[PDB]
Amino acid sequence: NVWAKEPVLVASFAIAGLAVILPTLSPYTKYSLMINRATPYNYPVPLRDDGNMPDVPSHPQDPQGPSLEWLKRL
């Protein structure tokens, strides 16, 4: 109906509507936020030892803290 008169307008509105709506439905924006968060620009500053913390491991080989393992599995 309008596809014959101004076709570049209709194509622009279609791709604009998907560029607005399409970021809602996603299994990937959570991955976007995780990858964008997990990049250390600054130095990871240590902390004073004992406020009686049964967490936060001392050797960086110890997997007690939250590591990243979804990276190497894409």
Binding site: Y43, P44, L47, H59, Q61, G65
Partner: protein, 171 residues
Amino acid sequence: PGIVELPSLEDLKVQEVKVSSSVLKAAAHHYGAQCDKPNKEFMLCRWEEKDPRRCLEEGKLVNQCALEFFRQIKRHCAEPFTEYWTCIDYSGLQLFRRCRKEQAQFDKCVLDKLGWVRPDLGELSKVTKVKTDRPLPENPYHSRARPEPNPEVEGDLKPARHGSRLFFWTM
């Protein structure tokens, strides 16, 4: 106002680890894995007490840990470490994907003869507890007390004493 207290040159003379910088980058992961364990004490000393000329003895200690690490990596395997850092050296800004197979060769060398599994991603992260000897300080900003608090006016109000207390129209 007051004089500064700057320390002596005879305390400010420790031999540096006078390596070049590209090889220092090329050996950095296993430098962070085995050594750099007592320098988080140094860095915590620095971030708590922001005074270089106060936490320099741990600077001497990280200097000797780095020098001992480089002695250990020099006298044993690898000599292919030399080929590895000159492989990573001349490729502009250093992408680690530039020289990967000789990184694997050096890793197999150190793994077979000495150990030191490579610190994985992202294990040079993950904010970390560490214990020290000296206790944490008070007032790291050398500052006076707060001068005068404001006495707050508190309590339920009585009604207005004689209206506006303007010229007239009382009540």
